């Protein structure tokens, strides 16, 4: 309800201006910040071509 006896609606077409920016594909700092303090051999069956 708005600031009355009034209804309002929030869709997921509402979400157009947030999920569609070209920052969803911006993971540069993520791989770098997790990279230090390494992980041991995780017997890479599905993690290797």
């Amino acid at each position: 309800w708005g600031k009355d006896h009034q209804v309002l609606r929030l869709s997921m077409e509402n979400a157009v201006g947030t999920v569609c920016h070209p920052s969803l594909m911006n993971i540069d700092a993520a791989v770098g910040g997790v990279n230090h303090d390494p992980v041991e051999a995780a017997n890479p069956y599905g993690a290797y071509v």
Binding site: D4, H5, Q6, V7
Partner: protein, 49 residues
């Protein structure tokens, strides 16, 4: 019963949802008053159209 009221008509599409009604809403689908504008003095043709 007294004096008569007069009923007049404006065509509408069938899916102009009823939630816009049940409310003090306006006929011409737009906030049409000269009070609501932002004091630009060319504003209320753009506030109406």
């Amino acid at each position: 019963h007294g004096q008569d009221a007069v009923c007049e008509f404006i065509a509408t599409p069938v899916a102009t949802d009823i939630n816009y009604f049940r409310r003090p809403c306006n006929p011409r689908g737009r906030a049409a008053g000269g009070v609501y504008a932002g004091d630009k003095e060319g504003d209320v043709i753009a506030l109406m159209y």
